[PDB]
Amino acid sequence: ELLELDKWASLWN
């Protein structure tokens, strides 16, 4: 996963 906006994952868990 080379997604930079993946930091939003904490907003769904």
The experimental technique used to determine this model is NMR
If one counts every other C-beta atom within 10 angstroms of the C-beta of residue 8, the result is: 8
What's CA 12's distance to the chain center, in Å? 9
What is the DSSP-derived secondary structure letter of residue 1? Answer: -
Cα torsion 2, 4, 7, 11 to 10°: value is -100
Burial of 5 (0-12, 13-18, 19+ CB in 10 A): exposed
